[model samples]
Target: MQIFVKTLTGKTITLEVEPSDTIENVKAKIQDKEGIPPDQQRLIFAGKQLEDGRTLSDYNIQKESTLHLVLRLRGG
Candidate 1:
C-alpha cells in the first residue's frame, strides 16, 4: 500500500508500505528519506495520533491516505 505524508515544513512524500507495517516502521522510513528522526516524529491520522504499536491496517489506512508529520519539541 502507498500512503501520502505531509511534513511539518509543508513538504509531501509518498511511502510504500505493507499492511502489516507499524507506525514506527513508517517513521523510520521518514527518517531515512526526510532526515527526521523517529523519536521526533509525531504522526497524526484522521485527527488522531498514530501510535507506534499499531499497524497501518489496524488503523484502516488505505492507499492515498495522508499522514501528517510534526516534529516534537525537546529541551526547555
Candidate 2:
C-alpha cells in the first residue's frame, strides 16, 4: 500500500508500505529514501504516537494513510 509521510521539508513523501510492516520499517524506509535517521524519526497517526516495535496493522493503519514525521532534535 502507498502512504503519505509529511515531513519537515515542506513536502509530502509517498512511501510504499505494507500493513504487516513495523513502525521501524517505515522509519528505516524514510531514512533510506531521505535523510532522517530511524532514531530521530517519530511517526504519528490519528493523533497517536507510533511505537517502533509495533506494526502498522496493530495501529489500524492502512491505505492512503497520512503519517506525520516529526523530527527529534539531538540536543538535550
Candidate 3:
C-alpha cells in the first residue's frame, strides 16, 4: 500500500508501506527519511496523538492515500 504524507511546513513525502504498518511505525519511517527523532516527532492527524499501537486501519487510513503528518510548531 502507498500513502502520501504532508508535513505542517507543506513538505510532502509519499511512501509505500506494508498493510500491517502502524502510526508509530510510519512516524519512525518519517523520522528516518526526514531525520526527526521520536521524541521530537509531533505529527498529529485529526487532532490526536499519533500513538505507536494505532494501525493505519485503526485510524481509517486509505490505501494509496494521501495523509498529513503535520509538523508541530514550537517556541515563538
Candidate 4:
C-alpha cells in the first residue's frame, strides 16, 4: 500500500507501507525522510487526530490512501 505523507517543509512524499503499520512507525519514517520528531508530528485522518501506536487498520485506512501530517515547532 502507498501512503501519502506531507511534511511541514511543504514536501509530499509517497511511501509504500503496510496496512498494519503503526502511527509510531509512520513517525519514524517521517523522521527518516523529513528529519522531524514524533512529538512534533501531527497525523490527521478524515479530520481526526491519530493516536500514537494506532495502526492504519484502527482508522480503517485503505490502500493508496492519503493521510495528512502536520509538524509543528515549539519551545519558543
* Residue-level error in angstroms, candidate 3, position 59: 1.5
Best by TM-score: 2
Clash totals for all candidate models: 0, 0, 0, 0
Q: How many times do residue backbones clash in model 1?
A: 0
Taking the tens digit of each residue's C-alpha lDDT, what string does model 2 give over 1-76? 9999998778999999899999988899999999888999888999999998999999999799899989997998
What candidate 3 gets wrong by more than 4 Å, as runs, is: 46-48, 72-76
Candidate 3 per-residue C-alpha lDDT over 1-76 given as tens digits, one digit per residue, 9 for 90 to 100: 8887777777888887875788778888988888876666665656666677778777766777666664554655
In candidate 2, clashing pairs total 0
2 versus 3: better lDDT goes to: 2
Better of 1 and 2 by TM-score: 2
Candidate 1: where is the Cα deviation over 4 Å? none
Measured against the true structure, the TM-scores of the candidates, in listed sequence, are 0.92, 0.93, 0.73, 0.86
Please write out the lDDT profile of model 1 over residues 1-76, one tens digit for every residue: 7889998777899999987999889999998998888998999999999999999999999888999988897876
Residue 33's lDDT in candidate 3: 87
Candidate ordering by lDDT (highest first) = 2, 1, 4, 3
Q: What TM-score quantifies how close candidate 4 is to the native fold? A: 0.86
Better of 1 and 3 by TM-score: 1
Q: What would the C-alpha RMSD of candidate 4 be, to one decimal place?
A: 1.4
lDDT of 2 at 38: 93
| Candidate maximizing lDDT | 2
